[PDB]
């Protein structure tokens, strides 16, 4: 069965919109789950003794919009009070209430599809024995799929995927590759090189396909405790070419960080 809402009801009986249907619609538009909120203090809450007065705060919890207009919440002294919005749809006249609790007791209850009381923490209010010392809001989470954006400003951090690979390149050379965002690679050299000539392909393992660059990458390395250096070429085909001077039977410790991009302009 298909239940339609944002459509013409010719007889004003067909597609009435329920509060839970708008709740789900709003949750979907903003990308919120039952474990977060949308919250805005239009005016600052006021702290008086062991109380927080929400002067004009709007909240969206489980896609349900409500306003706190001079609504006071009594607090526990010398405590971290977790302020919750509680939604009980069976309390038809007053479905929303606020509580100050000892822990974040957000329960993720699906009030739009099932029974139960939704509890969602939106504020953290710390008190002394006499009043409020600090207030910190709960993070408003946006769960999104694919974003097309022109410009972005990040005040915190972006967490991108990370892949690692250790290559025993041969001749005693070891590469430890870290790839981030599937593009930027930082190669850390380890081991000690011996029995190699300039221009020669190293005798060991070739770089795995996911770490291979589109174009040849020359990575500069250094010989530990010396004023001498080398470079290796990571070829698009996966092979590694030695471009330092010829090395004899005695291995010299190889170290250093080199970076490259896997992707070119495309």
């Amino acid at each position, epitope marked *: 069965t298909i239940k339609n809402f944002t459509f013409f009801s010719p007889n004003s009986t067909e597609f009435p919109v329920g509060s839970n249907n708008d709740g789900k619609l709003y949750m979907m538009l903003t990308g919120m789950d039952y474990r977060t909120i949308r919250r805005k203090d239009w005016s600052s809450p006021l702290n008086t003794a062991l109380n927080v007065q929400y002067t004009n705060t709007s909240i969206i919890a489980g896609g349900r919009y409500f306003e706190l207009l001079n609504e006071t919440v009594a607090l526990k002294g010398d405590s971290v009070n977790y302020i919750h919005a509680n939604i009980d749809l069976t309390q038809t006249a007053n479905p929303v209430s606020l509580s100050a609790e000892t822990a974040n007791n957000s329960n993720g209850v699906d009030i739009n599809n099932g029974s139960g009381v939704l509890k969602v923490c939106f504020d953290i209010v710390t008190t002394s024995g006499t009043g409020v010392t600090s207030t910190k809001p709960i993070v408003q989470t946006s769960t999104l799929d694919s974003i097309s954006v022109n410009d972005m400003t990040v005040s915190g951090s972006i967490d991108v995927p990370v892949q690692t690979l250790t290559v025993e390149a041969g001749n005693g050379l070891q590469l430890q590759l870290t790839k981030k965002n599937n593009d930027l690679v930082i190669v850390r050299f380890f081991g000690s090189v011996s029995n190699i*000539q*300039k*221009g*020669w*392909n190293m005798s060991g393992t070739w770089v795995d396909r996911p770490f291979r660059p589109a*174009a*040849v990458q020359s990575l500069v390395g250094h010989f530990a405790g010396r004023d001498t250096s080398f470079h290796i*070429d990571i*070829n*698009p*085909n996966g*092979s*590694i*070419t*030695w*471009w330092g001077a010829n090395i004899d039977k005695t291995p010299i410790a190889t170290r250093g960080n080199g970076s490259y991009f896997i992707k070119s302009a495309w």
Partner: nanobody
Amino acid sequence: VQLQESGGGLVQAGGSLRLSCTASRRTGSNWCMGWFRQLAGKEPELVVALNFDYDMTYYADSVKGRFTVSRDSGKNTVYLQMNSLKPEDTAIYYCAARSGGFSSNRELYDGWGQGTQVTVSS
């Protein structure tokens, strides 16, 4: 990855001869073009090679200062100018080409030729 093996035949000991090789395509970076030598039914071995991208040559100690490898424009053609020839040098010279620098291993070569026979008369 096809190969052409122009030049090669009969000449006297202490004389001079040449070898030509052209590859259809290049498999990637660190493009090395050269020749593998096979004397008296023994195992084939790389003797002369040129790193195209680096303009760096490799010659085995046994042929040093006697042989000279050259490149023709951007035609991906390699020439071996063999002067002061020896009877030991009588071998079957196959043309080898690869991406990834110089290597002793046969399998690592993307292009392998038919093989032109060198006969140094006495």
